[PDB]
Design a protein around this ligand. Sequence first.
Ligand SMILES: O=c1ccn([C@@H]2O[C@H](COP(=O)(O)O)[C@@H](O)[C@H]2O)c(=O)[nH]1
Ligand SMILES: [Mg+2]
Ligand SMILES: [Mg+2]
Length: 672
Amino acid sequence: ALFSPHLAESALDLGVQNGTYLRGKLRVSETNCFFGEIRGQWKGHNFERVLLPGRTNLNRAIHGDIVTVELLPVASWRPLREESEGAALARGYTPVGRVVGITTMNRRPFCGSIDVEELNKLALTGTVSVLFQPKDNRIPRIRITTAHLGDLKDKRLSVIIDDWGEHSSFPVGHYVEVLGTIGDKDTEAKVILLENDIPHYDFSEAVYDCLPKGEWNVTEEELGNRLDLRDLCVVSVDPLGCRDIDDALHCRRVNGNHLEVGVHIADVTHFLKEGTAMDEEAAKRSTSVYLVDRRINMLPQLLTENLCSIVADEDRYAFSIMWEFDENYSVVREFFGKTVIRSRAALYYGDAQRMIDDPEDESEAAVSLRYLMQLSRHFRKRREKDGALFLCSQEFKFKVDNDHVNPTDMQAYQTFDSNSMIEEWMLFANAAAARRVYASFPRWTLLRRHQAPAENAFDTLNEAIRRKIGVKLDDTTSLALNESLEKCVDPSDPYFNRLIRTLVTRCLRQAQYFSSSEVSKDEFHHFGLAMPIYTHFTSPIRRYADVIVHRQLAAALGIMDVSEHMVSVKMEALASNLNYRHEQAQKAGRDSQNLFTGFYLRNFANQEIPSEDGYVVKLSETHVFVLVPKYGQEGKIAKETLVRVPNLLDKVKVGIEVRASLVFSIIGLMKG
RNA sequence: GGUU
Ligand SMILES: O=c1ccn([C@@H]2O[C@H](COP(=O)(O)O)[C@@H](O)[C@H]2O)c(=O)[nH]1
Ligand SMILES: [Mg+2]
Ligand SMILES: [Mg+2]
């Protein structure tokens, strides 16, 4: 009655290979719950994706499901803003379809709370069916049934969908676990960990058995296999409270007017061996996940913060890259090899910046830092000349304290020139590792590419920029976009450039890890970095891609054996998980950031919090999305509530109200 | 996108 009956695998599976139906995985809009699409590559079709707009078109399918779709007649296709499909695609149309069936899966339980509307609509005896609101907004509300609504009101629950009948406007399901109270820090972190499928259990006894037992020390056997650099002034430069030091650097005068620079990375592969429980776990996690109030390390704590970590005044192993630069800052020598180092100081970015800028400081570390700063400044200019994108992101530091429920302060992270110096040096080391490894193993090198933006990606944003400042963004090359981004300036508002440099990050494709045999040498290109070949080598403590590159670099030099990296399915499955786990760890981090911003705003509960500048960043049929740079929060405001819908990129004054829900507004323009 |  409300939906068309689904088809049986009898005609579903035949139709897909027949071509009468197309098959793909459902991707639902993070903004709109009832708007999806299937991306893929079908036979006899020029298009890369089919839209599934509406509840009737999505036919009860959930995000992630493997749906079978039937194309709507080309007359019903969605344009840019009886015919042939090719005629329609030439006039910029997008294919449209209706979900005709689903492929059974282990569809995850969803974290969330009972929909507050249902709690307000009620004021209990017996069993009652009520609506559950999954935290994931791509998932519709599920109807659950409990005889203890009272004991569940304030709880975070996990719900599994059981079915969605042809006549029900919502699917039915049931709760499988009570995770805790809504608002609880540990429950809200468990929600984030579960929603992003983060493995976060303690390491097994098998994993801890892989660590070195007893008092750890550098051995004479290993020293006779390493370049001993312990007499060199090596330092590390990291954020505050960083116990995991992945890289350290040195710099000195050599051969008259030349400079030697080493980038010394933690020798994780000395402790982490292939085929062990520890490596099996590190491979699965693939990356360390960082939350506001906690972190889920890829490797055990003993390695992370002690034996691998380049700790100051402790002898440590390392896998170093070294270069000799001439007067023109051109490399005259390059060395990859295993070393034994001893960091003189584990510095914080600001301390390094003060040291460089203090005229009274003539210490070996201060001088080395000035040299690395000089050299890095040169690398940044060559990179802007190359066409590298210089984009912006906002990260907040949350001031927590055991005596307060909510964080007492929220400020942006501090940035110094030493932050750019470390970035340049790591970008330099990773690119040297990429080239060196690829010279040895052209058919299975773990690399990192970034495709150029999709077609018409900057259209919407360009309509607004050209309207406001008379400029357009040119994505033909990395260099053109970088030069046109430099011209994106509003003379009456200095934030405009940083805002555009932030919104342009949302128009780019995700960068991906890959085996060098998947594509041609020209497809190795990193659009964002304007580089022909790139990889991650500098963080094996917190990234498994780096572990694989350190392995391949040792086999490239012949100081280790080659592994079966070699098996095609295996090297392409390795990249696949690196990409999945990387994405989930990014969502987990952003989720935790939003969480703590909500907790900070709880300090002004039922109180009046002052109004800050905001910008119109998105415009749907129904809502105006406003970004408040001060808090890094995006508000959703209904067009029905406004005297006039503001234009895209308009700088408005945003009213913020805490009623535990956050309400946004535009100071002027609200209907009374 | 990118660095720690
Ligand atoms: O994705 C990341 C990577 C690193 N860090 C921060 O960077 C610091 C530098 O250490 P590392 O984790 O990069 O080795 C860490 O202490 C941590 O605070 C993050 O917050 N997120
Ligand atoms: Mg580090
Ligand atoms: Mg690191």
